Amino acid sequence: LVHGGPCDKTSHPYQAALYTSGHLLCGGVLIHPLWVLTAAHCKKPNLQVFLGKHNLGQQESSQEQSSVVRAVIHPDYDAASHDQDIMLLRLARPAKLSELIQPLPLERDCSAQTTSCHILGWGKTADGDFPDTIQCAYIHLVSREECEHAYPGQITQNMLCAGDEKYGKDSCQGDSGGPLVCGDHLRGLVSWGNYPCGSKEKPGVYTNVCRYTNWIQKTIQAK
Numbered sequence: 001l002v003h004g005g006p007c008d009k010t011s012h013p014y015q016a017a018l019y020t021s022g023h024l025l026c027g028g029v030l031i032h033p034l035w036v037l038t039a040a041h042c043k044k045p046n047l048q049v050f051l052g053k054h055n056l057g058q059q060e061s062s063q064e065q066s067s068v069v070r071a072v073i074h075p076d077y078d079a080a081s082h083d084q085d086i087m088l089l090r091l092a093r094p095a096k097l098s099e100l101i102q103p104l105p106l107e108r109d110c111s112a113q114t115t116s117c118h119i120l121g122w123g124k125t126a127d128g129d130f131p132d133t134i135q136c137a138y139i140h141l142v143s144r145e146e147c148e149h150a151y152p153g154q155i156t157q158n159m160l161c162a163g164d165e166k167y168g169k170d171s172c173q174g175d176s177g178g179p180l181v182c183g184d185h186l187r188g189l190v191s192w193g194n195y196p197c198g199s200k201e202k203p204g205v206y207t208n209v210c211r212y213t214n215w216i217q218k219t220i221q222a223k
């Protein structure tokens with residue numbers, strides 16, 4: 001995450017860190033004790049989910065590690081255009097809830113009134129390095145018209161745009177699949193955006209979570 005700062009230690013109990021091959025791959029959101037939501041482009045072998053983390057460089061008493069037993073990519077995900085960039089991960093071990101491990105409720109209304117938004121993750125910072133401590137930033141939703149102008153013929157109804165006109169606070173590589181939180185609800189998932197990272201004119205593009213209520217519920221309730 002570029003141009004942000006360290007999160008408050010107790011503000012992100014729903015944040016997951018996804019690992020493969022021993023290093024940080026993506027963010028993710030705990031939405032149910034057995035399920036983490038992330039971006040479909042985070043699908044890699046032997047995913048390891050870490051909950052209750054703040055600093056990746058230290059062993060924390062609140063952390064919980066779980067293997068993934070099932071990875072459910074949206075049937076209409078299109079890697080080329082990033083359309084429908086969403087994936088459900090079923091945990092081997094149900095999350096042992098604590099003050100630092102809690103699910104985040106989903107935004108079910110696509111016409112939700114504007115609320116204060118934020119992003120977070122262990123993605124690349126402004127200096128080009130990967131931080132041990134999770135970064136946070138306030139950002140605002142950008143109108144669909146403004147975003148269509150920023151990325152012509154690239155924005156679908158399955159995408160939301162969000163950014164920061166003042167410093168260009170933005171999500172980046174490694175923040176993928178992390179949450180766009182609006183009014184204490186999951187509004188979006190980190191999907192794609194500008195290269196290099198920065199949202200002054202070309203806002204970050206987020207998977208529009210409100211569009212996936214039925215698919216999420218059907219997947220979680222399946223079998």
Ligand SMILES: N=C(N)c1ccc(NCc2ncc(-c3ccccc3)[nH]2)cc1OCc1cccnc1
Nearest residue numbers: 041079171172173176191192193194195197204205
């Ligand atoms: N600026 C942003 N808001 C932003 C946030 C997250 C990401 N994640 C990387 C990422 N998204 C999708 C894929 C992907 C999908 C399919 C196939 C292979 C790759 N990879 C990228 C972002 O901006 C572009 C960007 C690209 C690379 C390095 N830095 C920034």
